[PDB]
């Protein structure tokens, strides 16, 4: 499953939904830690906001 | 393609502000206004910035001084 645009949510804006085109991949707290471990700041901000 | 950034890290020892300065250089490269200083192989701005920093053409100081001089001809 791959997406660049598609199903968002109501209460939140996290992209997920659809049996035709699904949401993106959950960038959970583990991956946020992984980025924080490096000097990964702008990539983290992309993961979070944009 | 730039396999390694170690040579760039050699010029800019922090390895974090290296990202900032090369990002500024590459953004001035992509956004219209600045023309390249190193030949390309149909490459985007990123490896251009890496090559420019690697040969010492661009660092924090050159980008800053250049943005001054350009500010002075545009104000005239």
């Amino acid at each position: 499953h791959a997406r660049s645009t598609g199903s968002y949510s109501l209460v939140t804006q996290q992209p997920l939904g659809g049996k035709a085109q699904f949401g993106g991949q959950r960038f959970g707290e583990m991956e946020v830690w992984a980025l924080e471990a490096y000097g990964a700041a702008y990539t983290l901000q992309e993961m979070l906001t944009v | 393609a730039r396999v390694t950034v170690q040579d760039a890290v050699e010029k800019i020892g922090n390895r974090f502000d290296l990202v900032l300065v090369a990002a500024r250089r590459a953004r001035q490269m992509q956004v219209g206004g600045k023309d390249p200083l190193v030949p390309e192989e149909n490459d985007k701005t990123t490896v251009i910035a890496l090559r420019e920093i690697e040969e010492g053409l661009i660092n924090n100081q050159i980008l800053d001084v250049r943005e001054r001089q350009e500010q002075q001809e545009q104000e005239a």
């Binding site: 791959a2 660049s4 959970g28 583990m30 471990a37 000097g39 702008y42 983290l44 | 396999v3 390895r15």
Partner: protein, 1352 residues
């Protein structure tokens, strides 16, 4: 576009709640069912929360973008943007004030503690169980007291119109109104200066601190009682149509409907003057409904109709696991991402990965559109969309162009350490699976058995650059937890390398002379020689020498053809000796490490890729296959099995005779089977190891076998000796339920198929292993989460701070031998002291500097025993750590860069190996294994008439000085021992240098004279078991767990007096001449017996060990990081000076230490179940143990100091980890410790309250300020306190971080009542906010913002 330096949390006021509200929700109506237009004025309302559809009044009046600055005044509905409906809040005017459940049922009840009133009383008042007086009058009734129905009626009858008392939340709110904070603060301040009573002063101090904190919060206590209840915007509690009779509705919607219903009913009842019972019932309704809405679950659950499930509440939506749901997990979904199964990428370069064409097209659709419109192949975005969905060949060149430079992030489904996400250059591949570089799968811990990986696209140019510089695989060739490379050849490539380098004894083309490895490759590929054969080859090796210049040396080496072929690959600059050997996993890893250290990054990456290709190619050419014959059964398996059966049958027969006990019989059988298993394994390994017996020229010789399974065993590709043992030998002993080892082991292996019953036996082991893996994975996840929480905010903020403090750093010796040398523990560390050579006083290490491999080699050459190293814990930096105090470790041999987040990398480093954690001649006679100088540390011994070097106390160590300065064998001498060696005597290896009975600790007298019984009653302290043969007895001093009624009033002791009766003191020992007998000290020598120096006085029975008392793995690591008590804290001597006993057994015996100088009285408690190692009248020092058993981190930090507790934690955790073969740089545990002790307790304040638990950084800046200033107030003194990682993360400076990953409700309540104002400057805080983290790339940005703050 929004700028804000900090977030304040406080108590919401009814006025500002109305300020948020745009309209009052007066009806529980929602919609018109058939027409889904929201009702007025219901929970969904355009008149209140704004219009439903974009820029049009919900009356059909105005439908245009023109009518947007003016609202519709022709009807209630207003006209704005629809997104406004997602932000507008409402308010409900509660007829009766309602208490907030959070301020009520939290374990510290803020309402309860502010009123200093116990919880049951608030529960009864609020729930209308009893009345409470809201101020009285001139009555005998207190200002505050609860009264029952009849008591309240009696008070009302007795006292007329002077009695103000109500019931419930109205009464609580009235009480909060009647309470004034500032005036009480003034009263307490006046009273404190006047009061001298201890308890009164403590009460005044507690109350004044609480009230002053509440006033500083700027909150009015009445606000804890909700008068107006805010209601969430409807979009955050959506009501969306669904097919059929089912419609998605929020549990919040139903909860607010219930609240509105009950409020309206209360209003109607009040308007109707309903009886008191009914109005009390309806107020109970409102209180219960509000409590469920705020937090359903602390009131006996609330369920709805047509659905049996606890309704979601606001607290339940906030409180989540793991962490906050929407913000971080679960789960913060992301766009521009894909996911697919991974396959091997054996042709790829390290810096690139195979990405399927379809995923590349879907991921980069905006990029494709941009480039198509750039070259003008599409006139609009829609045309580009049609082109890409048609997938014409035109868009594919655009796709190749956009992919060429763009790097993409590859992510494993679980992320244990920072290598779980790595950048690669995508390479377009036809197919559907992501091809992953084989070298990288080790870092991902990903095996190609259906594992799925995700791909993320860094969009912005800064992110592309950031990924190429940091995320890239080639930039992360070294593990962050250890300098040795993480991209190591693993299994197939290792097997190929091993087969290529392993030499035979006879093959084609032996004895040839070759020049260059090129002739070797020519001979091998032409089939004129064999891949491995002893050959002299002329090769030019290059040596990095002089100043970094290559030294070409060309000479002949005796090697093999495969080795020369490999040497062709090896880049110039490495010694040939590295490859002229059999290459296992360890050999290749070491060779890569040497290549990286000597050459650099680019040669290392190129060499790793080339070695991967070579290993794969020569493994394929090897044809290494596992058949059915390559598990050759040892010939002695049947013989050994039959023998062991014979001995176990003999033992069973003897057990029936009653000669041997059941336990001894079981132990003997287990030992017999273990010996049989070892014999079988050894025979199997001898058979497989040297299976080849082929002749070199006619003379047969025994050399390494060509057997394939022995190749995978020896090369360490896959399968160890234990693994092959279950295949070719016999799989041996296992365990049954209850975890006991089975009496009869499995005598079969996997080549001789197991029978039914033995397989059923093995099933238990399989189930236990699988369940253990699952539970240990969950526990490791929780542990690493806690480590991330405590180490979240730590980041390198300074290049250097300047400090000569540090830790004393030595190679560690536990037991009797060294298992971790000095070099590995000190590699990459910075010096704290210019340590001299072990001989001459020469400085070989300059002022504080990074220690790389050359300095470590210099230290090894001049072996210095200890080095002071600047640890992070001793760093003087505040709000961060200096670069030097951390070290160098990352992905480079250079010092850490300023801005790097060491806390997170350390937490990941300690957490990731957590899935790998599934957990005579000792104490009888000390046997030094090698020959070296004997040295005694903290020894108390004097030579007696028998030449016995009897050591007293359990705090003496025996080290082994080597040829220069290094201890290599260390031992612990217990209380009472005999030593025939001196303090400088040389001892041979394996020689018994000390000895004592394994059945008991003997107390050997060092003086002479009659034994006098001091504090003795024959029948209370000692019991009569006189067995006089030569003047002996079996008098038993009762154990120090329980004694008699008269044995608890005396401390039994044996004084040694001469014939004259004068005291004869022991020379050269702190021990007094009056031996204070501890528990079970059997008095062999009776009163009136001449004792010789060298005779036992009282034996302390023991068992020579034989019982396991050591645990490890995840629970041990967690308990160490939580600073848990060991259930028996070994209390230390907490001040130096002479010690003495106190009054005996008030329940717990007291011990008074009075220093020889200074403040004398230091009486303390000791429980009577402890085994004392302290003897009254001896000179002890702060740090010496007082009772045996394990220690707790708290008192270690408190007494022995910060460095000591850091050393203890590091050593203990590293002992657990080295037990499983996992190596972690101790700096990670050091930074975790530094985060654990960030809180301190004030003794003397500067502006504190003399007991305030305060952040050490603020305390340190304040003490620095007062010291530099002429104002030395007060003060100020502090003592560092140690808190568990959960507690440290829970009590941080920012309430966002604490509330995020821990108890959210209680943290939020504490922050609100305290009015906390977190100022960010923390990774997780900025993550939640959604701005650049103050670490790494973002550190430059935040440092800029720091300059913009507090200054123009």
């Amino acid at each position: 576009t929004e700028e804000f330096d900090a977030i304040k949390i406080a108590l919401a006021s009814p006025d500002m709640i109305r300020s948020w509200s745009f309209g009052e929700v007066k009806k529980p109506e929602t919609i018109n069912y058939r027409t889904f237009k929201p009702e007025r004025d219901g929970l969904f309302c355009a008149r209140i929360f704004g219009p439903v559809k974009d820029y049009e009044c919900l009356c059909g009046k105005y439908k245009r973008l023109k009518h947007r600055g003016v609202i519709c005044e022709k009807c209630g509905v207003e006209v704005t943007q629809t997104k406004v409906r997602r932000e507008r809040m409402g308010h409900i005017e509660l007829a009766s004030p309602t208490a907030h459940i959070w301020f009520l049922k939290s374990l510290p009840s803020r309402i309860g503690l502010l009123l200093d009133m116990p919880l049951r009383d608030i529960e009864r008042v609020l729930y209308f169980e009893s009345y409470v007086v809201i101020e009285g009058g001139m009555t005998n009734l207190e200002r505050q007291q609860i009264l029952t129905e009849e008591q309240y009626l009696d008070a009302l009858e007795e006292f007329g119109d002077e009695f103000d008392a109500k019931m419930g939340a109205e009464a609580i709110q009235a009480l909060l109104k009647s309470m004034d904070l500032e005036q009480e603060c003034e009263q307490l301040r006046e009273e404190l200066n006047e009061t001298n009573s201890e308890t009164k002063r403590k009460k005044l101090t507690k109350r004044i601190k609480l009230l002053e904190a509440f006033v500083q919060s700027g909150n009015k206590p009445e606000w804890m009682i909700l008068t107006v209840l805010p209601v969430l915007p409807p979009d955050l509690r959506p009501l969306v149509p669904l097919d059929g009779g089912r419609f998605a509705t929020s549990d919040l919607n139903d909860l607010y409907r219930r609240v509105i219903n009950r409020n309206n009913r209360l209003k109607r009842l009040l308007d109707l003057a309903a009886p008191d019972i009914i109005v009390r019932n309806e107020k109970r309704m409102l209180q219960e409904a509000v409590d469920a809405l705020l937090d359903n679950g602390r009131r006996g659950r609330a369920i709805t109709g047509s659905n049996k499930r606890p309704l979601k509440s606001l607290a339940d939506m906030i409180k989540g696991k793991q962490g906050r749901f929407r913000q971080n997990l679960l789960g913060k979904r992301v766009d521009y991402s894909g996911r697919s199964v991974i396959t091997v990428g054996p042709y790829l370069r390290l810096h690139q990965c195979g990405l399927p064409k379809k995923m590349a097209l879907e991921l980069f659709k905006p990029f494709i559109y941009g480039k198509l419109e750039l070259r003008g192949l599409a006139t609009t975005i829609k045309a580009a969309k049609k082109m890409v969905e048609r997938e014409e060949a035109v868009v594919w060149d655009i796709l190749d162009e956009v992919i060429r430079e763009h790097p993409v992030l590859l992510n494993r489904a679980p992320t244990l350490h920072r290598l779980g996400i790595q950048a690669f250059e995508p390479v377009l591949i036809e197919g559907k699976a992501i091809q992953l570089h084989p070298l990288v799968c080790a870092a991902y811990n990903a095996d190609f058995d259906g594992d799925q990986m995700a791909v993320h696209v860094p969009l912005t140019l800064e992110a592309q650059l950031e990924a190429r510089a940091l995320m890239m695989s080639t930039n992360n060739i070294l593990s962050p937890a250890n300098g040795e490379p993480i991209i190591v050849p693993s299994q197939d490539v290792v097997l190929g390398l091993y087969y290529m380098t392993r030499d035979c004894v006879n093959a084609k083309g032996e004895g040839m002379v070759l020049t260059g490895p090129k002739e070797a490759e020519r001979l091998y590929r032409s089939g004129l020689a064999s891949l491995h054969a002893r050959v002299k080859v002329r090769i030019t090796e290059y040596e990095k020498d002089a100043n970094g210049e290559l030294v070409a040396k060309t000479s002949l080496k005796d090697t093999t053809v495969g080795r020369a072929i490999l040497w062709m690959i090896v880049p110039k600059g490495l010694p040939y000796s590295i490859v002229n050997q059999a290459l296992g996993k360890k050999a290749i890893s070491k060779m890569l490490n040497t290549c990286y250290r000597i050459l650099g990054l680019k040669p290392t990456v190129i060499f790793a890729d080339q070695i991967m290709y070579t290993g794969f190619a020569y493994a394929a050419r090897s044809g290494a296959s596992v058949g059915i014959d390559d598990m050759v059964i040892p010939e002695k398996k049947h013989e050994i099995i039959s023998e062991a059966e014979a001995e176990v049958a003999e033992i069973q027969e003897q057990f029936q005779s009653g000669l041997v006990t059941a336990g001894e019989r079981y132990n003997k059988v287990i030992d017999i089977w273990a010996a049989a298993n070892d014999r079988v394994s050894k025979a199997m390994m001898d058979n497989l190891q040297t299976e080849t017996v082929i002749n070199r020229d006619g003379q047969e010789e025994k050399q390494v076998s060509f057997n394939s399974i022995y190749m995978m065993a020896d090369s360490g590709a896959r399968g160890s000796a234990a693994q092959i043992r279950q295949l070719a030998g016999m799989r041996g002993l296992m365990a049954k339920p209850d975890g006991s080892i089975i009496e009869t082991p499995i005598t079969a292996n996997f080549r001789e198929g197991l029978n039914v019953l033995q397989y059923f036996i093995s099933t238990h082991g399989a189930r236990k292993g699988l369940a253990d893996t699952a539970l240990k994975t969950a526990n490791s996840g929780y542990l690493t989460r806690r480590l991330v929480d405590v180490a979240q905010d730590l980041v390198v903020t300074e290049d250097d701070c300047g400090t000569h403090e540090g830790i004393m750093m030595t190679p560690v010796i536990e037991g009797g031998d060294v298992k971790e040398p000095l070099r590995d523990r000190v590699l990459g560390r910075v010096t704290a002291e210019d340590v001299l050579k072990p001989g001459t006083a020469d400085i070989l290490v300059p002022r504080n500097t990074l220690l790389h491999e050359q300095w470590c080699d210099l230290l090894e050459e001049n072996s210095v025993d200890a080095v002071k190293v600047r640890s992070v814990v001793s760093c003087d930096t505040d709000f961060g750590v200096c670069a030097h105090c951390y070290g160098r470790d990352l992905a480079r041999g250079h010092i850490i860069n300023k801005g790097e987040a060491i806390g997170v990398i350390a937490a990941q480093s300690i957490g990731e190996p957590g899935t790998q954690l599934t957990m005579a001649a000792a104490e009888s006679s000390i046997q030094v294994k090698n020959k070296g100088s004997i040295k005694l540390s903290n020894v108390k011994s004097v030579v007696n008439s028998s030449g016995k070097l009897v050591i007293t106390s359990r705090n003496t160590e025996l080290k082994l000085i080597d040829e220069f300065g290094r201890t290599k064998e260390s031992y612990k001498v217990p209380y009472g021992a005999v030593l025939a060696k001196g303090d400088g005597e040389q001892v041979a290896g394996g020689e018994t240098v000390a000895n004592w009975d394994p059945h008991t600790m003997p107390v050997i007298t060092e003086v002479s004279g009659f034994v006098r019984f001091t504090d003795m009653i024959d029948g209370q302290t000692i019991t009569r078991q006189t067995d006089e043969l030569t003047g002996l007895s079996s008098l038993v001093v009762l154990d120090s767990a329980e004694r008699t009624a008269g044995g608890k009033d005396l401390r039994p002791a044996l004084k040694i007096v001469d014939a004259q009766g004068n005291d004869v003191l022991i020379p050269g020992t702190d021990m007094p001449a009056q031996y204070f007998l501890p528990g079970k000290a059997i008095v062999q020598l009776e009163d009136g017996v001449q004792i010789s120096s060298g005779d036992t006085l009282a034996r302390i029975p023991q068992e020579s060990g034989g019982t396991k008392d050591i645990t490890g793995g995840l629970p041990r690591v967690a308990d160490l990081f939580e600073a848990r008590r060991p259930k028996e804290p070994a209390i230390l001597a907490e001040i130096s000076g002479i010690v003495s006993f106190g009054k005996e057994t008030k329940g717990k015996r007291r011990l008074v230490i009075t220093p020889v100088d200074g403040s004398d009285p230091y009486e303390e408690m000791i429980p009577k179940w402890r085994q004392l190692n302290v003897f009254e009248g001896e000179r002890v020092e702060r740090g010496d143990v007082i009772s045996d058993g394990p220690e707790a981190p708290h008192d270690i930090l408190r007494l022995r100091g910060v460095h000591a507790v850091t050393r203890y934690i590091v050593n203990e955790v590293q002992d657990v980890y080295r037990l499983q073969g996992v190596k972690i740089n101790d700096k990670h545990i050091e930074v975790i410790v530094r985060q654990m002790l960030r809180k301190a307790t004030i003794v003397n304040a500067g502006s504190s309250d003399f007991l305030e638990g305060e952040q050490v950084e603020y305390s340190r800046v304040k003490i620095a300020n007062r010291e530099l200033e002429a104002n030395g107030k007060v003060g100020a003194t502090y003592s560092r306190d140690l808190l568990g990682i959960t507690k440290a993360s829970l009590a941080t400076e920012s309430f966002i971080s604490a509330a995020s990953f821990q108890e959210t409700t209680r943290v939020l309540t504490e922050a609100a009542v305290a009015g906390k104002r977190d100022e960010l400057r923390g990774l997780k805080e900025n993550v939640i906010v959604g701005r650049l983290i103050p670490a790494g790339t973002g550190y430059a940005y935040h440092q800029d913002r720091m300059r913009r703050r507090a200054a123009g």
